[PDB]
Amino acid sequence: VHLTPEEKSAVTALWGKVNVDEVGGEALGRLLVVYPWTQRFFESFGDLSTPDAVMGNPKVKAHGKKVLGAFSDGLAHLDNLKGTFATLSELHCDKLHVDPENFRLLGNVLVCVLAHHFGKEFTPPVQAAYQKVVAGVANALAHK
Amino acid sequence: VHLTPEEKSAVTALWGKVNVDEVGGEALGRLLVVYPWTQRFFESFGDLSTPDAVMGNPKVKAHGKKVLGAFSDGLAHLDNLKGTFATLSELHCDKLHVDPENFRLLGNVLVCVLAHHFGKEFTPPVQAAYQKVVAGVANALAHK
Amino acid sequence: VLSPADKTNVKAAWGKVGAHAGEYGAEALERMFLSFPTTKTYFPHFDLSHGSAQVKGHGKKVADALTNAVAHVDDMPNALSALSDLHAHKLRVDPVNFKLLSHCLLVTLAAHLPAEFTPAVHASLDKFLASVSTVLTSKYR
Amino acid sequence: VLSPADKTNVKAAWGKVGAHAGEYGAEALERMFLSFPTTKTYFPHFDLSHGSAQVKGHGKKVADALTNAVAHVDDMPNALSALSDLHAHKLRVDPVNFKLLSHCLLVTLAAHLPAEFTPAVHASLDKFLASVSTVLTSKYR
Numbered sequence: 001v002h003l004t005p006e007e008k009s010a011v012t013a014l015w016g017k018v019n020v021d022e023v024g025g026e027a028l029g030r031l032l033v034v035y036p037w038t039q040r041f042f043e044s045f046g047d048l049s050t051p052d053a054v055m056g057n058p059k060v061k062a063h064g065k066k067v068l069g070a071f072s073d074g075l076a077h078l079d080n081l082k083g084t085f086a087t088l089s090e091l092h093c094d095k096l097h098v099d100p101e102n103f104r105l106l107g108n109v110l111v112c113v114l115a116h117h118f119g120k121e122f123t124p125p126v127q128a129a130y131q132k133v134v135a136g137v138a139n140a141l142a143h144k
Numbered sequence: 145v146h147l148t149p150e151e152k153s154a155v156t157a158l159w160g161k162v163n164v165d166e167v168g169g170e171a172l173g174r175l176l177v178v179y180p181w182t183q184r185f186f187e188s189f190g191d192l193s194t195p196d197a198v199m200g201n202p203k204v205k206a207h208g209k210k211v212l213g214a215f216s217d218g219l220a221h222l223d224n225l226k227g228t229f230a231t232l233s234e235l236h237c238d239k240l241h242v243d244p245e246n247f248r249l250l251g252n253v254l255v256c257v258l259a260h261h262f263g264k265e266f267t268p269p270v271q272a273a274y275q276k277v278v279a280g281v282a283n284a285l286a287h288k
Numbered sequence: 289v290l291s292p293a294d295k296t297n298v299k300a301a302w303g304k305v306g307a308h309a310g311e312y313g314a315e316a317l318e319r320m321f322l323s324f325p326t327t328k329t330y331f332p333h334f335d336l337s338h339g340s341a342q343v344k345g346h347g348k349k350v351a352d353a354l355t356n357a358v359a360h361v362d363d364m365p366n367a368l369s370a371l372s373d374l375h376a377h378k379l380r381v382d383p384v385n386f387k388l389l390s391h392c393l394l395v396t397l398a399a400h401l402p403a404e405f406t407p408a409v410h411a412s413l414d415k416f417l418a419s420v421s422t423v424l425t426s427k428y429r
Numbered sequence: 430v431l432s433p434a435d436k437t438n439v440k441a442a443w444g445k446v447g448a449h450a451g452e453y454g455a456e457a458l459e460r461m462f463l464s465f466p467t468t469k470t471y472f473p474h475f476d477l478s479h480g481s482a483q484v485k486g487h488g489k490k491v492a493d494a495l496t497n498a499v500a501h502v503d504d505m506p507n508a509l510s511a512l513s514d515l516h517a518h519k520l521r522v523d524p525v526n527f528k529l530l531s532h533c534l535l536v537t538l539a540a541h542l543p544a545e546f547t548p549a550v551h552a553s554l555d556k557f558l559a560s561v562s563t564v565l566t567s568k569y570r
């Protein structure tokens with residue numbers, strides 16, 4: 001993925017302000033709540049029977065941090081997203097068999113989380129840059 | 145895209161039997177007829193007001209041959225689909241602004257055309273190999 | 289939205305298929321499992337090899353559901369009610385999978401109804417299947 | 430399928446938005462045009478720059494349509510009838526674009542309703558928008 005300097009600025013300025021310990025779990029939790037068929041892959045996480053149960057689930061948040069960790073790593077290697085997500089691709093595609101459509105759903109739910117957190121600060125152009133980033137990431141995970 | 149030897153056989157044996165002068169136009173015509181929003185991109189082709197008008201339209205068939213020509217070329221360079229569809233990507237993505245979802249629709253309509261033509265000969269495994277091929281092609285066109 | 293012309297077309301295809309519907313249903317499932325392996329994770333306990341009686345029996349159930357849908361086409365939401373609950377709430381079937389199976393169902397018919405699968409009939413079956421799929425995923429909305 | 434809980438949630442979000450609905454509608458369109466440039470080809474004659482009165486006026490039309498939908502939520506197909514004809518038959522709007530705009534409409538609300546955009550409300554608005562979009566594309570089925 002190639003972002004113009006202004007798109008990288010847009011993305012990077014915001015990212016440095018992200019609470020890496022919460023946003024990841026909020027994105028994953030909202031995915032499980034908004035698109036319930038994704039819960040099929042987390043039978044081991046426990047109680048996911050209500051929004052509150054999901055959101056307040058220790059495993060959901062603990063797992064979201066890894067996800068957010070993955071996006072951060074991606075952000076750093078936007079030129080080699082294929083190489084970067086190589087192993088994650090094998091895992092989700094070959095082992096888990098997650099339909100790639102869901103990587104796009106998670107990327108977009110992330111975008112909603114960022115808008116929620118930053119408000120007026122997540123301007124239309126800032127969103128446009130982030131859409132390019134999640135598309136690139138979803139694409140890299142999908143290569144397998 | 146990497147096909148196993150048996151998937152390449154499956155694909156190649158059938159392809160050599162394809163009427164390169166008709167299947168391309170049949171795939172494009174069916175796309176315009178089944179998914180009418182794609183017609184928005186062919187305002188210049190003329191009468192596309194009915195299935196028969198579309199299917200029997202000289203421009204639709206003439207254009208389908210180019211499309212089929214593109215798949216054939218892809219088939220030959222399944223290892224460098226990115227390089228192969230580089231210019232076609234710029235055209236459809238940057239110039240025409242076609243949503244990539246439609247490259248997947250066209251690939252699948254092609255698959256239906258092949259099944260129609262070959263019948264029992266387009267077995268489930270033969271279809272599986274072709275699905276891998278159209279996905280790879282749709283992906284290459286989408287890179288821009 | 290399932291105009292009289294489409295109903296006529298889907299009823300014509302149904303007729304030609306006839307007693308082979310279940311077998312074609314089994315074939316579409318196999319086509320789906322082979323072409324889109326992700327769908328296999330919904331049938332962990334099924335044996336998916338060729339000739340599998342489990343796939344044959346399920347193909348018949350799928351065909352029977354599709355026939356009940358066309359038989360009550362003007363009220364598919366009601367007719368497909370219990371199956372929507374099953375697919376969305378219990379099995380948690382991913383919406384995208386309905387598109388995959390629909391594509392395989394069409395491919396199967398195309399491979400068996402040379403005469404019937406005209407561009408017009410194909411458009412009508414496509415809309416018929418999209419309606420069924422929209423009903424089967426309505427429980428998510 | 431638009432259960433009482435979802436209606437309650439969508440009605441609560443609608444209330445908080447209030448008189449800003451049209452402006453938020455304009456903002457969602459801008460978000461869509463910037464994030465998904467392919468959608469711009471449907472508005473060749475519109476000026477899409479920021480502050481564009483054409484986008485502001487259209488945002489109000491979109492917001493008004495969405496409010497009429499929630500106002501007649503139990504009969505959206507009838508209420509959204511003329512708009513479905515327009516979007517599918519005349520404009521030939523690609524089904525995927527409804528998903529893109531819906532995503533932008535949600536993002537806009539998220540950015541304006543800190544308190545209201547809880548996971549539960551988000552799920553309810555998502556289903557509300559998917560219903561509207563399914564009605565707006567029903568003319569293709």
Ligand code: HEM
Nearest residue numbers: 038041042066067070071092098102103104106107138141
């Ligand atoms: C597009 C964003 C995605 C990213 C960046 C991402 C990233 C990650 C990472 C880093 C791991 C942990 C790997 C490890 O423990 O070594 C993981 C595991 C997992 N992810 Fe994702 N993921 C994404 C999407 C999805 C989606 C949408 C699903 C399915 C609904 C999914 C289901 C899982 C499952 C079940 C595991 C646990 C694997 C295990 O521990 O056995 N992922 N993901």
Ligand code: HEM
Nearest residue numbers: 182185186210211214215236242246247248250251282285
């Ligand atoms: C995935 C399969 C696709 C392939 C392999 C393909 C291939 C081609 C090729 C080879 C050309 C002619 C390029 C030239 O004249 O130099 C072309 C042109 C065109 N295609 Fe596609 N195409 C695909 C999908 C689509 C779709 C789905 C649409 C939109 C509904 C689209 C719309 C057009 C248009 C309007 C042109 C004409 C460009 C012009 O002459 O100005 N294509 N395509």
Ligand code: HEM
Nearest residue numbers: 327330331349350353354371379381385386389390420424
């Ligand atoms: C055209 C759409 C579909 C139709 C008409 C259909 C119909 C049915 C029918 C009639 C049953 C049996 C219900 C019963 O025995 O009580 C069933 C069960 C099932 N379906 Fe579908 N289905 C559809 C799509 C799908 C798709 C897309 C998937 C997932 C990829 C799927 C996965 C399942 C599973 C796993 C079962 C239960 C199998 C078992 O445990 O025995 N179905 N379906």
Ligand code: HEM
Nearest residue numbers: 468471472490491494495512520522526527530531561565
């Ligand atoms: C939430 C779904 C949507 C709603 C509620 C909505 C609502 C409307 C309304 C109320 C109008 C004006 C009708 C009139 O003035 O008579 C309209 C027109 C239009 N819409 Fe949508 N729309 C939706 C999605 C979309 C999408 C996804 C696209 C394409 C990307 C689109 C493209 C258009 C165009 C091009 C016009 C006509 C513009 C003009 O020529 O003045 N709409 N829409």
Ligand SMILES: */[SH]=c1/[nH]nc([C@@H]2COc3ccccc3O2)[nH]1
Nearest residue numbers: 104105108109112528532535536
């Ligand atoms: S605010 C929110 N929550 N989910 C979304 C979805 C995710 O799935 C998609 C797939 C394709 C295009 C757009 C979306 O938006 N937005």
Ligand SMILES: */[SH]=c1/[nH]nc([C@@H]2COc3ccccc3O2)[nH]1
Nearest residue numbers: 248249252253256387391394395
């Ligand atoms: S037989 C036929 N005609 N069209 C199709 C479609 C094309 O669009 C798709 C998108 C994603 C997955 C499957 C399909 O099948 N099959």
Ligand SMILES: */[SH]=c1\[nH]nc([C@@H]2COc3ccccc3O2)[nH]1
Nearest residue numbers: 092093100142143144275279323
């Ligand atoms: S996670 C990921 N990426 N690609 C895929 C699948 C694999 O198998 C396919 C078969 C036919 C079409 C598309 C496919 O993509 N999972």
Ligand SMILES: */[SH]=c1\[nH]nc([C@@H]2COc3ccccc3O2)[nH]1
Nearest residue numbers: 131135236237244286287288464
């Ligand atoms: S033909 C093609 N390939 N990619 C694309 C677009 C370009 O712009 C985007 C913005 C946000 C998400 C995904 C995109 O893919 N057209």
Ligand SMILES: S=c1[nH]nc([C@@H]2COc3ccccc3O2)[nH]1
Nearest residue numbers: 245387388390391414417524525
């Ligand atoms: S986008 C868009 N519009 N209609 C569709 C579906 C999805 O894929 C299909 C799969 C089988 C039959 C019809 C299909 O069209 N996708």
Ligand SMILES: S=c1[nH]nc([C@@H]2COc3ccccc3O2)[nH]1
Nearest residue numbers: 383386387418421422425428559
């Ligand atoms: S909710 C949601 N998202 N996608 C759907 C269904 C699934 O399968 C379809 C198949 C054809 C056309 C539309 C379809 O939408 N329901």
Ligand SMILES: S=c1[nH]nc([C@@H]2COc3ccccc3O2)[nH]1
Nearest residue numbers: 101383384528529531532555558
């Ligand atoms: S697959 C599947 N199931 N539901 C969806 C849609 C499409 O993208 C969306 C865009 C905005 C809101 C909800 C959305 O979910 N896609």
Ligand SMILES: S=c1[nH]nc([C@@H]2COc3ccccc3O2)[nH]1
Nearest residue numbers: 418524527528559562563566569
């Ligand atoms: S036909 C066909 N294919 N896809 C659709 C609509 C478009 O927008 C949607 C938005 C959310 C959920 C399902 C949707 O299906 N209608």
